[PDB]
Amino acid sequence: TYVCGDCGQENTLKSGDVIQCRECGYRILYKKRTRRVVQYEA
């Protein structure tokens, strides 16, 4: 799952050629953070 830039939409594209946002036109995508438990030492 990848988040677009100025456009709010999840691309969820894993193809090598699919790098462009759908119905947006821009080619900048941000990887979304899933629900994973991570431990830190305070």
Add this chain to the structure above:
Amino acid sequence: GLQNVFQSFGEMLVEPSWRYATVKFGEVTVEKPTFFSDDKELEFLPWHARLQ
């Protein structure tokens, strides 16, 4: 700046050896930056160029 640059150069006659060809430059206009996407034209921003 560009107008004086293009208005200072002088084109000479073109003759490899009657017919002859001469060129000239008129008004110089610069458009705003744009992104040539596959779908259509989009707004272009400095951070778009930085990331891409």
